[PDB]
PDB file of C-alpha atoms in Angstrom:
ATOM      1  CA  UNK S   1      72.038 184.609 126.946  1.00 39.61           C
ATOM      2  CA  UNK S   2      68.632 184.990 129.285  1.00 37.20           C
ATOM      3  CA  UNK S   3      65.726 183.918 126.998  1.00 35.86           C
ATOM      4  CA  UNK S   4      67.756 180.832 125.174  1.00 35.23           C
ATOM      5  CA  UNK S   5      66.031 177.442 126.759  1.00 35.22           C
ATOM      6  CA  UNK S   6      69.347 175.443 125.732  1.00 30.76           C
ATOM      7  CA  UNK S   7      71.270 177.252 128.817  1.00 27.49           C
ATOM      8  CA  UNK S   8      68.628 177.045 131.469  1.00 27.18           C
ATOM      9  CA  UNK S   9      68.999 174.632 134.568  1.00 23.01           C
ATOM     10  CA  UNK S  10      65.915 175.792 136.878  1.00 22.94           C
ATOM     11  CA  UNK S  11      62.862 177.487 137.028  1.00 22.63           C
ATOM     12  CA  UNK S  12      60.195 178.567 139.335  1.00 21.95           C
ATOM     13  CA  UNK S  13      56.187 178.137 138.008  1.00 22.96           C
ATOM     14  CA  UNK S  14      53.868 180.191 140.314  1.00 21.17           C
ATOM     15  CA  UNK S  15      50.351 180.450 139.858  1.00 18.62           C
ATOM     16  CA  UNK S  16      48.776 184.079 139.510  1.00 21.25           C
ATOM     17  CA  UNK S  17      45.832 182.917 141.221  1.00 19.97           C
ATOM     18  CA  UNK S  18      47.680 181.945 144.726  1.00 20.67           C
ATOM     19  CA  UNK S  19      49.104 183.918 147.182  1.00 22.43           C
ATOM     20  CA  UNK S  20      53.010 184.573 147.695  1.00 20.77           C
ATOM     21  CA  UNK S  21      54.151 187.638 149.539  1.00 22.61           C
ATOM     22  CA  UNK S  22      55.750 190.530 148.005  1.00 19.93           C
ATOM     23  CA  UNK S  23      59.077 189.746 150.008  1.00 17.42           C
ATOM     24  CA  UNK S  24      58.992 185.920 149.072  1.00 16.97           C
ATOM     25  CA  UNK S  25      58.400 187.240 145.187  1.00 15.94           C
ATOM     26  CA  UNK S  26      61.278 189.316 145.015  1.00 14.51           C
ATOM     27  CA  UNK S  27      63.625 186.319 146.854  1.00 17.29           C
ATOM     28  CA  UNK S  28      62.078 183.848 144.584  1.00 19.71           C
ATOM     29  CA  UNK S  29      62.745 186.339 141.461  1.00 20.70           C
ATOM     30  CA  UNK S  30      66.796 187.160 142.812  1.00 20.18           C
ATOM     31  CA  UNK S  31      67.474 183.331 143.686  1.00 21.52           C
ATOM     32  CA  UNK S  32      69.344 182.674 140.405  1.00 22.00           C
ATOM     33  CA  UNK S  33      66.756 180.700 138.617  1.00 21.94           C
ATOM     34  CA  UNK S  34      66.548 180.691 135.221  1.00 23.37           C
ATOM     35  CA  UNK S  35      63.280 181.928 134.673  1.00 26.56           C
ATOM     36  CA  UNK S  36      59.867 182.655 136.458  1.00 29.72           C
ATOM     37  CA  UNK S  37      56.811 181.149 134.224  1.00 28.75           C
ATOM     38  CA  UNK S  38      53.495 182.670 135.363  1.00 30.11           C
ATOM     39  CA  UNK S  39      51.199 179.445 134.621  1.00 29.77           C
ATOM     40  CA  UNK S  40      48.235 177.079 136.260  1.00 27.95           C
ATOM     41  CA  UNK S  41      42.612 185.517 134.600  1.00 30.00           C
ATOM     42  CA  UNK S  42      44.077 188.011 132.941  1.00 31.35           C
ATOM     43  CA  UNK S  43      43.817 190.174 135.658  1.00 33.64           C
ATOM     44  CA  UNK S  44      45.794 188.108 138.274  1.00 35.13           C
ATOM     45  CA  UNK S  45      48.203 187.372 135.239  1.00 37.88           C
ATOM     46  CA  UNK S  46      48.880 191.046 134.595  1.00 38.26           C
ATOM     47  CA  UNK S  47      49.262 191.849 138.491  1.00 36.62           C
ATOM     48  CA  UNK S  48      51.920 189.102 139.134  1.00 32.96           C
ATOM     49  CA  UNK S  49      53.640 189.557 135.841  1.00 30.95           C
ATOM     50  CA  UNK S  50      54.169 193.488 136.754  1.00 31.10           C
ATOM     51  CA  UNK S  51      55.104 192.456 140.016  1.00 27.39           C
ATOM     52  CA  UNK S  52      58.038 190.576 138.538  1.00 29.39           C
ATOM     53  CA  UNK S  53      59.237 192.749 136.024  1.00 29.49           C
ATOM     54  CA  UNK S  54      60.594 194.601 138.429  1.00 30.22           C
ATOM     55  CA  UNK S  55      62.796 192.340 138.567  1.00 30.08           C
ATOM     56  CA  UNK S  56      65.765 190.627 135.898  1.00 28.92           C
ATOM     57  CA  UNK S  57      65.163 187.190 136.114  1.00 30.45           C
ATOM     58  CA  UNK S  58      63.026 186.268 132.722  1.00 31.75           C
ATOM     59  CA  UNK S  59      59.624 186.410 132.714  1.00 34.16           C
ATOM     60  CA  UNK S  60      57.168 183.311 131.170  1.00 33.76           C
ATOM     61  CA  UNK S  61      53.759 183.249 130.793  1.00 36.05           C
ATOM     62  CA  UNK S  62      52.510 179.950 130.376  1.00 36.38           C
ATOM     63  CA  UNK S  63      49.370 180.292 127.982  1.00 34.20           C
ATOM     64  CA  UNK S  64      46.692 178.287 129.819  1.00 34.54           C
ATOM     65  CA  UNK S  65      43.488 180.322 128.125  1.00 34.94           C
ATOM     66  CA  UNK S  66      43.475 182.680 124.919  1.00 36.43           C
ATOM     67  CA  UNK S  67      41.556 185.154 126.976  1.00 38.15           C
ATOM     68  CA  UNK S  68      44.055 185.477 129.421  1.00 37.91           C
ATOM     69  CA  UNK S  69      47.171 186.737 127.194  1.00 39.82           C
ATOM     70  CA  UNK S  70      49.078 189.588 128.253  1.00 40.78           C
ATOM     71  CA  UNK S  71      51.584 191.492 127.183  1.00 40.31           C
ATOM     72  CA  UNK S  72      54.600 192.676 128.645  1.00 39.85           C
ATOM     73  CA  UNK S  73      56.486 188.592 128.964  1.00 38.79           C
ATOM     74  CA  UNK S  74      60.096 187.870 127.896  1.00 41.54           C
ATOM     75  CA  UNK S  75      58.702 184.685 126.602  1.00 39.96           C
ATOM     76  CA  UNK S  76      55.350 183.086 125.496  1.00 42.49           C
ATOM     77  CA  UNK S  77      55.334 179.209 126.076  1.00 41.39           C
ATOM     78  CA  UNK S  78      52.153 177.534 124.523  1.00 38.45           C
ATOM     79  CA  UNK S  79      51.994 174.314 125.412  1.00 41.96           C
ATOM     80  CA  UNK S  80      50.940 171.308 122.965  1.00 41.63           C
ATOM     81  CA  UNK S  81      49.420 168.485 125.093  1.00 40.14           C
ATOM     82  CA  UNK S  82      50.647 165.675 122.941  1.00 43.35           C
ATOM     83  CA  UNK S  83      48.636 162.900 125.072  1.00 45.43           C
ATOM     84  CA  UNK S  84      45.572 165.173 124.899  1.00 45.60           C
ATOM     85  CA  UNK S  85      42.410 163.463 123.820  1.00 46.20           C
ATOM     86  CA  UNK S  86      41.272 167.043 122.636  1.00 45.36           C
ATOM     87  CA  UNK S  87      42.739 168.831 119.846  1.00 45.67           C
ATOM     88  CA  UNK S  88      42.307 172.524 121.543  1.00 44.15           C
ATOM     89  CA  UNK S  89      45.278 171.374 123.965  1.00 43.46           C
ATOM     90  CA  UNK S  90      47.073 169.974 120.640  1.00 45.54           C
ATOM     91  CA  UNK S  91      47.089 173.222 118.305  1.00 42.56           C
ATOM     92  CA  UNK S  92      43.726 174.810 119.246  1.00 41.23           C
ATOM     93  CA  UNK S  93      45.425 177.259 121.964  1.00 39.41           C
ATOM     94  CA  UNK S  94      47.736 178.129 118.925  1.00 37.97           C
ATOM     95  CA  UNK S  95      45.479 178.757 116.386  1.00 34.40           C
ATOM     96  CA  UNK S  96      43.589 180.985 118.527  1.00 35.54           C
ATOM     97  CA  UNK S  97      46.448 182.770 119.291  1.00 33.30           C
ATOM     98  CA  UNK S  98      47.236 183.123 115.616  1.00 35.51           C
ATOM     99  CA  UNK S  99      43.815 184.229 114.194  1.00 40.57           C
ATOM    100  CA  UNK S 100      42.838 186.348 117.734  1.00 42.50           C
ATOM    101  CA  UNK S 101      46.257 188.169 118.247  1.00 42.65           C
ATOM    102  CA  UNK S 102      48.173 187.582 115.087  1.00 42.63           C
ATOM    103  CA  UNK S 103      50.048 191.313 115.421  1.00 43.75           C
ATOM    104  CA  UNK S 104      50.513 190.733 118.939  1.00 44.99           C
ATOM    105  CA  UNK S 105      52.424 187.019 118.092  1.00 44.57           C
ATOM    106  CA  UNK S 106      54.279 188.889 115.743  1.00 44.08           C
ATOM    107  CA  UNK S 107      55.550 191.108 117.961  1.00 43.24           C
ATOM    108  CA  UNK S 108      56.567 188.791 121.181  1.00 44.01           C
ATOM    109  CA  UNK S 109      58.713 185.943 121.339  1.00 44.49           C
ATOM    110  CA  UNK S 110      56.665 182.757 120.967  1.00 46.32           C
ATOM    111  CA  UNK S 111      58.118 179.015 122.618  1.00 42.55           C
ATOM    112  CA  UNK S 112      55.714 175.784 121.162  1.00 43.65           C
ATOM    113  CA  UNK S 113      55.809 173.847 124.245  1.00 46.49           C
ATOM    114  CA  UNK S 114      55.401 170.455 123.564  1.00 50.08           C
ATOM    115  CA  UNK S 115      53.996 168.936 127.148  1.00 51.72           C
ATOM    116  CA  UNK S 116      53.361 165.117 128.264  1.00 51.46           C
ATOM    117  CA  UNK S 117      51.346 164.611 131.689  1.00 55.38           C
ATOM    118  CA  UNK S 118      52.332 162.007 132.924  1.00 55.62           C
ATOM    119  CA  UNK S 119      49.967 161.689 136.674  1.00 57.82           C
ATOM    120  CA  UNK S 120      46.933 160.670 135.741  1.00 57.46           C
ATOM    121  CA  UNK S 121      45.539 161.755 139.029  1.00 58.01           C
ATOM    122  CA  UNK S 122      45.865 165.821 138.887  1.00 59.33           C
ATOM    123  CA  UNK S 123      43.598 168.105 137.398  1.00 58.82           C
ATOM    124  CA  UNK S 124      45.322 169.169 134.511  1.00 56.30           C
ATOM    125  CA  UNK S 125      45.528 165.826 133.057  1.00 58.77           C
ATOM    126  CA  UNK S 126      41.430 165.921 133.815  1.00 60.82           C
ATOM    127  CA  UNK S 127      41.209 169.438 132.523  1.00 59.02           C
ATOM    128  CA  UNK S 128      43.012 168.489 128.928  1.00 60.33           C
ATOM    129  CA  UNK S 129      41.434 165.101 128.936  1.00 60.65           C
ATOM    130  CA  UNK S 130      45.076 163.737 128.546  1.00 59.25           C
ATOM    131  CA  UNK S 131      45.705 160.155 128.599  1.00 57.61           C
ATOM    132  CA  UNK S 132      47.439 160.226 131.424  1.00 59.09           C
ATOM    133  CA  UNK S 133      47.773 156.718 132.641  1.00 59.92           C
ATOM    134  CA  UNK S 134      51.138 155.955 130.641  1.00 60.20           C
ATOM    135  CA  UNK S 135      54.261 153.352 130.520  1.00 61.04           C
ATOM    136  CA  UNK S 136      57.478 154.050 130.325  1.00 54.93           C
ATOM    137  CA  UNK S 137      57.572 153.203 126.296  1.00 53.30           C
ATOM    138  CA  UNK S 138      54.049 155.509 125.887  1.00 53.12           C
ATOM    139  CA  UNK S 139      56.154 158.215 127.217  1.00 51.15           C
ATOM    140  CA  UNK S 140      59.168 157.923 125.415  1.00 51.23           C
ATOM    141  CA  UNK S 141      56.997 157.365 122.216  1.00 53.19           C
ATOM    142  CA  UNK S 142      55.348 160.816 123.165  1.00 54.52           C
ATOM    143  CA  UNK S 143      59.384 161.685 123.586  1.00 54.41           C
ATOM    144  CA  UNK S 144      60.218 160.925 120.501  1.00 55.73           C
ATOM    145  CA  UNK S 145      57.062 162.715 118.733  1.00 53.87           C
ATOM    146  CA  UNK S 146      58.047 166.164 120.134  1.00 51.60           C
ATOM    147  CA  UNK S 147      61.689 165.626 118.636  1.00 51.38           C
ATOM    148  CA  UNK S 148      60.344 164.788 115.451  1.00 51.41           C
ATOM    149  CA  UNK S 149      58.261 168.003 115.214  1.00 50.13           C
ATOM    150  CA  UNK S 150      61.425 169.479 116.887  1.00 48.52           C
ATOM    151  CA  UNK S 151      59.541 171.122 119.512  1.00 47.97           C
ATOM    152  CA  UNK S 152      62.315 173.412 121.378  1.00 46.50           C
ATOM    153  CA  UNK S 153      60.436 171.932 124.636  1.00 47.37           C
ATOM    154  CA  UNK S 154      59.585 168.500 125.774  1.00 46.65           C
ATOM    155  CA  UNK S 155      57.787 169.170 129.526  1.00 44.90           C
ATOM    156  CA  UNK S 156      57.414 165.869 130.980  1.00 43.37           C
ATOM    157  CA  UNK S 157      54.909 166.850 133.775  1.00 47.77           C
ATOM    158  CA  UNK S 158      53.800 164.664 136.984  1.00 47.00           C
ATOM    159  CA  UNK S 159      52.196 168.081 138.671  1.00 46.70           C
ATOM    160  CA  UNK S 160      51.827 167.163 142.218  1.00 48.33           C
ATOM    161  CA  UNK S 161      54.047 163.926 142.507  1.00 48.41           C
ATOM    162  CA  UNK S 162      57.493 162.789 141.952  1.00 49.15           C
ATOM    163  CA  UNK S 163      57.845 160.799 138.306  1.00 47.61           C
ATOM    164  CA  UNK S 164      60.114 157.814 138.138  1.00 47.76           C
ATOM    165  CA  UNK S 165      63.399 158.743 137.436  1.00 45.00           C
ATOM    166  CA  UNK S 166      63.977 156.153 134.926  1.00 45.36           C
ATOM    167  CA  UNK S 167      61.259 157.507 132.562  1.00 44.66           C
ATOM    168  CA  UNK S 168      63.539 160.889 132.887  1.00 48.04           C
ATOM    169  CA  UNK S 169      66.376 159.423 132.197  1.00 42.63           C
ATOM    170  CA  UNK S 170      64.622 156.907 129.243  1.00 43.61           C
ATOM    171  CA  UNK S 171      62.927 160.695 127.897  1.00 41.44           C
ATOM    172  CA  UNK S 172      66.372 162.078 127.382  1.00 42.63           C
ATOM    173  CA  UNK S 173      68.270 159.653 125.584  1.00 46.58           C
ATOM    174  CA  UNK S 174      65.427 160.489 122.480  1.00 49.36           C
ATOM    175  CA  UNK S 175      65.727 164.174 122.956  1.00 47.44           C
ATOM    176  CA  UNK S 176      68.271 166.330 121.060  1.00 46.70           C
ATOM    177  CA  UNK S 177      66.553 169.521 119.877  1.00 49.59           C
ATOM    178  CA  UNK S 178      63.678 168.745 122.553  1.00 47.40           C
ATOM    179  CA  UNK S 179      65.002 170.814 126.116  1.00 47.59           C
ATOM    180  CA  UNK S 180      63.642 168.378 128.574  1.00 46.54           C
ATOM    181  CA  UNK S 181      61.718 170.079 131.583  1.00 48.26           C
ATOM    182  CA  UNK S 182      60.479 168.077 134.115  1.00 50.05           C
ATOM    183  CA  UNK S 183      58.283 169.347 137.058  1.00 52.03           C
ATOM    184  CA  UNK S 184      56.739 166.667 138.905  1.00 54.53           C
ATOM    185  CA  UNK S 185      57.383 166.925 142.829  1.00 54.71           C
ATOM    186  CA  UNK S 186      60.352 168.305 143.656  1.00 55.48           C
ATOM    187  CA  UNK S 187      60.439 170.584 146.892  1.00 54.80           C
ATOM    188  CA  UNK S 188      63.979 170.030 147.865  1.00 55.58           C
ATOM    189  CA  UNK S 189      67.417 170.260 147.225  1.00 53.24           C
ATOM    190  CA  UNK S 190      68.232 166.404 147.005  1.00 53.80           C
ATOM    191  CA  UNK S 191      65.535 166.020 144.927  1.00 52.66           C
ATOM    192  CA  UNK S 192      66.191 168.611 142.454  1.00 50.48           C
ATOM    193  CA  UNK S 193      69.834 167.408 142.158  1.00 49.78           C
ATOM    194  CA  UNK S 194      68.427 164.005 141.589  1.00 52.89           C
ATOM    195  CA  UNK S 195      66.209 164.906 138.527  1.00 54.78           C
ATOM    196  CA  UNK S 196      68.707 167.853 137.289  1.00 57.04           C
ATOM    197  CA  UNK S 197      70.807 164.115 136.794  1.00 58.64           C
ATOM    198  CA  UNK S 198      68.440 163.548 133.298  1.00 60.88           C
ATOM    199  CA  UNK S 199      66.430 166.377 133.169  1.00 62.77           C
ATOM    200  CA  UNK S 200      67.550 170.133 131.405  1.00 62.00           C
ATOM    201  CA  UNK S 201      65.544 172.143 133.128  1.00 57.95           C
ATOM    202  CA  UNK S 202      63.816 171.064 136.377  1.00 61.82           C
ATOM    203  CA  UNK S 203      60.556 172.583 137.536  1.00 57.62           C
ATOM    204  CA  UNK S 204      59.696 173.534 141.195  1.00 55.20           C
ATOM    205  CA  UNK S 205      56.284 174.781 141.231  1.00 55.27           C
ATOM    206  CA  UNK S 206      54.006 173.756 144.399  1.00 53.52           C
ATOM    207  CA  UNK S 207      56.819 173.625 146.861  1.00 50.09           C
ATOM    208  CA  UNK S 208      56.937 177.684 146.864  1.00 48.30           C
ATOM    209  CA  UNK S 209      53.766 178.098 148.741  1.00 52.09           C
ATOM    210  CA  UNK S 210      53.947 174.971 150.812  1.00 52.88           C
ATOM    211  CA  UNK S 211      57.862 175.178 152.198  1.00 52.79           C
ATOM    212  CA  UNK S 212      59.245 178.536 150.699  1.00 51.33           C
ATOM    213  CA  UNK S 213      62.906 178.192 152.083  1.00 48.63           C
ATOM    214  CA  UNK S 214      63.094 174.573 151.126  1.00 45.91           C
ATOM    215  CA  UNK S 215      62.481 175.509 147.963  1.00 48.51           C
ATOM    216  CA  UNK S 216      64.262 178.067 148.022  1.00 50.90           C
ATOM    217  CA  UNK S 217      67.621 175.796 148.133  1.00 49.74           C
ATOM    218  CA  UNK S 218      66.762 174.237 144.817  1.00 49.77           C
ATOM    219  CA  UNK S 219      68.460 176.919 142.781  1.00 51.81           C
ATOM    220  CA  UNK S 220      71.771 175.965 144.412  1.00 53.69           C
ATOM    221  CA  UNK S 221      71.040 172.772 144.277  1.00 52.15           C
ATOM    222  CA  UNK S 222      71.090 172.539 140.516  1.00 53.14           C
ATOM    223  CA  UNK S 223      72.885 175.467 139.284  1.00 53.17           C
ATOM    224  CA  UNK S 224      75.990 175.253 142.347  1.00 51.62           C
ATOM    225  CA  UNK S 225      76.244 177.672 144.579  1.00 52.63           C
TER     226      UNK S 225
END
């Protein structure tokens, strides 16, 4: 399969609203990685997502903002904040998806992603008013939620900064139905192979625009060469 979670190893998150060149795109989209998730207006969204259809590799969009839905994505992942503080980042998102675009939810494949930041110091924890500032048993509590609401996606998320690897590995001895992602850091090979250890599905996001061959080698890394 292509657009069944459960077999995925690796994927690339790019925001639409930075720069990558046309000729690191199409590597990035031909590496072997599982997927490409578009996530951080609908205008940049629409020009980077028909920039990678071109392409096979599946196609996310990550639904940050209602007003920025568009169509034409393998997959629709909308996350569910479970440490959020505010319940637009719980359901809200959703339930403005439903009443707003209910024929177009109909018609595309829709992913509930359940999501737990984890860094208390990036913006997205700021932006969703998560709390952020969690142990080890908060997390795996949060863990354990998402499997209970089987959630096909647990993201554990540290943004910017590698998260400790034994609140991975503690994260996926709760999760059955859950696919664990993590993203959190990685922007190299060794790394990638070290979290692709506990982690289903590891996350390299940032790295792209700051070391593009280095993250490159990821893929390989975690899916074998």
């Amino acid at each position: 399969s292509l657009y069944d979670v459960t077999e995925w190893k690796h994927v690339f998150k790019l925001d639409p609203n930075k720069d990558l060149p046309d000729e690191q795109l199409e590597i990035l989209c031909e590496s072997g990685t599982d997927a490409v998730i578009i996530g951080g207006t609908e205008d940049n969204v629409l020009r980077m997502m028909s920039k990678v259809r071109r392409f096979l590799v599946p196609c996310v969009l990550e639904v940050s903002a209602i007003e920025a839905i568009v169509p034409g994505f393998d997959l629709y992942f909308i996350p569910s904040v479970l440490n959020s503080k505010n319940a637009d980042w719980i359901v809200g998102m959703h339930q403005k998806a439903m009443k707003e675009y209910g024929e177009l939810m109909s018609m595309e494949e829709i992913v509930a992603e359940g999501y737990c930041i984890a860094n208390p110091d990036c913006k997205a924890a700021a932006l969703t008013e998560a709390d952020a500032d969690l142990n080890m048993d908060d997390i795996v509590a949060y863990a354990r939620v998402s499997e209970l609401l089987q959630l096909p996606i647990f993201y554990l998320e540290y943004s910017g900064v590698l998260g400790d690897i034994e609140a991975v590995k503690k994260t996926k001895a709760v999760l059955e139905t859950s696919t664990l992602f993590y993203g959190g850091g990685i922007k190299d090979a060794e790394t990638a192979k070290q979290y692709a250890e506990h982690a289903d599905v590891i996350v390299v996001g940032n790295a792209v625009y700051e070391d593009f061959d280095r993250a490159l080698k990821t893929v390989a890394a975690v899916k074998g060469e």
